[PDB]
Structures are given as C-alpha cells and as structure tokens.
Amino acid sequence: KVFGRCELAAAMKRHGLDNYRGYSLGNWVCAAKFESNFNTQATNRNTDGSTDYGILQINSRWWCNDGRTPGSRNLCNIPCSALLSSDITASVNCAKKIVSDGNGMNAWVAWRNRCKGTDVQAWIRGCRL
Ligand SMILES: [Cl-]
Numbered sequence: 001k002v003f004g005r006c007e008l009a010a011a012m013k014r015h016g017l018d019n020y021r022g023y024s025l026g027n028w029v030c031a032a033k034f035e036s037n038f039n040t041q042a043t044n045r046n047t048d049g050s051t052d053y054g055i056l057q058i059n060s061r062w063w064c065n066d067g068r069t070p071g072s073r074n075l076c077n078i079p080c081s082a083l084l085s086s087d088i089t090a091s092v093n094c095a096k097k098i099v100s101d102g103n104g105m106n107a108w109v110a111w112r113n114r115c116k117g118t119d120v121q122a123w124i125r126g127c128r129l
Pocket residue numbers: 024025026027120121124
C-alpha cells in the first residue's frame with residue numbers, strides 16, 4: 001500500500017507514535033517519506049547482507065527474521081514479511097522498541113541526515129488529525 005502523507009500521519013497517531021519518546025509526529029512522517037516514500041512494500045538490501053523492510057525500513061540484523069541474515073537476531077519477534085502489510089501495526093510496535101533502544105531516532109540514518117533539526121511540522125501541514 002502507498003499511503004498519502006495525511007493518511008500515514010493519521011495511522012501513526014492512532015498507533016501512538018505522536019510524541020513517543022518525545023518525537024513529534026512530523027519526525028515519524030519525515031522518516032517514512034525518506035525511508036520508504038510511504039510504501040509499505042519497500043525492501044532494500046544493506047551492504048552487510050541484512051535487509052530493511054516496510055514503511056520504516058526495519059533491519060533484519062536485529063529486529064525481524066527473514067531467514068537469510070547470519071548471526072542476526074529477531075528482537076521484535078516477527079517475520080520481516082509482517083513489516084510489508086497494508087496495516088502498519090507490526091511496523092509501529094517494532095519502531096517503538098528501536099527508538100527506546102538508546103540512540104532514539106538516530107537509529108534511522110535517513111532521519112539523522114534528512115529530518116533531524118529541520119522544520120518537521122511541515123510534514124503534518126493541512127492534516128485533519
Ligand atoms: Cl511535528
């Protein structure tokens with residue numbers, strides 16, 4: 001599913017991402033835009049042989065099982081295929097565990113390089129939330 005900006009904003013707010021660990025909703029929408037272009041079916045292979053899955057490009061090295069990432073872990077206890085659903089629940093529940101892990105949203109390199117320090121409220125402009 002390719003979400004619209006305000007459809008994703010609304011889905012992330014309902015699932016409790018707005019101000020989760022102090023990250024305002026625009027941070028999460030900005031991250032999704034640059035990780036996946038709001039595409040739930042987005043997959044990207046990393047140099048280390050891990051893969052990133054879904055709207056928030058969650059990595060198979062630590063967080064989900066795809067059965068082809070050596071000496072990986074599955075800390076969110078889910079197959080990486082569950083991160084590609086039209087329903088963002090499994091992505092949101094894994095993102096909450098990632099962002100609690102210690103370095104907050106710096107875990108998403110695209111957030112650090114493209115969103116961090118920018119006017120992220122622009123991402124939720126005109127949205128009926
Ligand atoms: Cl915001």
